[PDB]
Amino acid sequence: VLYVGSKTKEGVVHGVATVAEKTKEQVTNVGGAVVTGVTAVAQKTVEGAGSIAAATGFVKK
Amino acid sequence: VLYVGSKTKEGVVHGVATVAEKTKEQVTNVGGAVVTGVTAVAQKTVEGAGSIAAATGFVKK
Amino acid sequence: VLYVGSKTKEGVVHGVATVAEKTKEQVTNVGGAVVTGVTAVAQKTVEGAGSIAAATGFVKK
Amino acid sequence: VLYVGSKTKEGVVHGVATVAEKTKEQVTNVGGAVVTGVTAVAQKTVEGAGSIAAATGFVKK
Amino acid sequence: VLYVGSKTKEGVVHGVATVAEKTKEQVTNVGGAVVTGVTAVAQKTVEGAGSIAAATGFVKK
Amino acid sequence: VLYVGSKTKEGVVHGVATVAEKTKEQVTNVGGAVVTGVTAVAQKTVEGAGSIAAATGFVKK
Numbered sequence: 001v002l003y004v005g006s007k008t009k010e011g012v013v014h015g016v017a018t019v020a021e022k023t024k025e026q027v028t029n030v031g032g033a034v035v036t037g038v039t040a041v042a043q044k045t046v047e048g049a050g051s052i053a054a055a056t057g058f059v060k061k
Numbered sequence: 062v063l064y065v066g067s068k069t070k071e072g073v074v075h076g077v078a079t080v081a082e083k084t085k086e087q088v089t090n091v092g093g094a095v096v097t098g099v100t101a102v103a104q105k106t107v108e109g110a111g112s113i114a115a116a117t118g119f120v121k122k
Numbered sequence: 123v124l125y126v127g128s129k130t131k132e133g134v135v136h137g138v139a140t141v142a143e144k145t146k147e148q149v150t151n152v153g154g155a156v157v158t159g160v161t162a163v164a165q166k167t168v169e170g171a172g173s174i175a176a177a178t179g180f181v182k183k
Numbered sequence: 184v185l186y187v188g189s190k191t192k193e194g195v196v197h198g199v200a201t202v203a204e205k206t207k208e209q210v211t212n213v214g215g216a217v218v219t220g221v222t223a224v225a226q227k228t229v230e231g232a233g234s235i236a237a238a239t240g241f242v243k244k
Numbered sequence: 245v246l247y248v249g250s251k252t253k254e255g256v257v258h259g260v261a262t263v264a265e266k267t268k269e270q271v272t273n274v275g276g277a278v279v280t281g282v283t284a285v286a287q288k289t290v291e292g293a294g295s296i297a298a299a300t301g302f303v304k305k
Numbered sequence: 306v307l308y309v310g311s312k313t314k315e316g317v318v319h320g321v322a323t324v325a326e327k328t329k330e331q332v333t334n335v336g337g338a339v340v341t342g343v344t345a346v347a348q349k350t351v352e353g354a355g356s357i358a359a360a361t362g363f364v365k366k
Contacts, residue, residue, distance in 0.1 A: 285348075
């Protein structure tokens with residue numbers, strides 16, 4: 001009946017420092033799904049299904 | 062009946078520093094899905110399904 | 123009945139510094155989907171399905 | 184008698200990413216020396232004295 | 245008599261990522277020396293005295 | 306008589322990631338020397354005295 005919110009964080013990323021020194025980097029995909037290199041991601045879903053790094057091979061019927 | 066929000070963060074990214082030194086980088090895809098290199102992403106979905114880095118192979122019926 | 127919002131962030135990215143030194147970078151796609159190099163993206167969807175980096179192979183019926 | 188140099192780095196800075204979120208920042212000096220906020224500096228001195236961030240109070244004789 | 249150098253690094257900084265979230269930051273100096281916040285600095289001195297972050301109070305004679 | 310150098314690093318810093326979350330930070334100096342916050346520094350001195358973070362109170366004669 002009364003919701004008093006204040007400074008309330010939800011699905012939040014802050015203060016990230018990364019270093020990635022790589023001399024070679026390959027990704028070879030054939031007919032599938034590949035998710036690589038996600039970093040510092042945030043979301044908030046209301047009344048729905050949410051996925052950050054979701055991979056699936058194939059959906060058949 | 063009364064919602065008093067204040068400084069309320071939702072799905073927020075802030076304060077990211079990245080360095081990526083790579084000498085070679087390849088991605089070879091054949092008939093699929095490849096998601097690579099996502100960084101510092103944010104979203105907020107109301108009454109819907111939300112996905113940040115979603116890969117799928119194929120949807121058949 | 124009364125919504126008093128203030129300084130409320132939603133789906134927000136701020137304060138990002140990136141450096142990407144790469145000597146070679148290739149992407150070879152054949153009949154699929156490839157999403158690469160997303161950085162500092164934000165969105166907010168009301169009553170709809172939202173996707174940031176979504177890849178799909180093919181939708182058949 | 185023969186100096187063959189190649190790709191020889193000396194006094195070199197490369198590939199720096201910084202983020203500095205500060206809400207207040209003061210510096211109060213009275214009759215002295217204050218050096219603040221040096222970042223990504225490089226030099227090379229031949230036959231001479233070199234200093235990057237040197238502070239001194241006073242030189243009297 | 246013959247110096248063959250190759251890819252020889254000297255006084256080199258590379259690949260640094262820093263994040264500094266500070267809400268307040270003060271420096272109060274009175275008649276002295278203050279060196280603050282040096283980051284990612286490089287130098288090379290030949291036949292001379294070199295100093296990176298050197299502070300001194302006062303030199304009297 | 307023959308110096309064959311190759312990929313020889315000297316005084317080198319590489320691959321540093323730091324995060325510094327501080328809510329308050331003060332430095333109060335009176336007639337002295339204060340060195341604070343050095344990070345990722347490199348140097349190489351030939352035939353001379355070198356100092357990275359050197360503090361001294363005062364030199365009198």
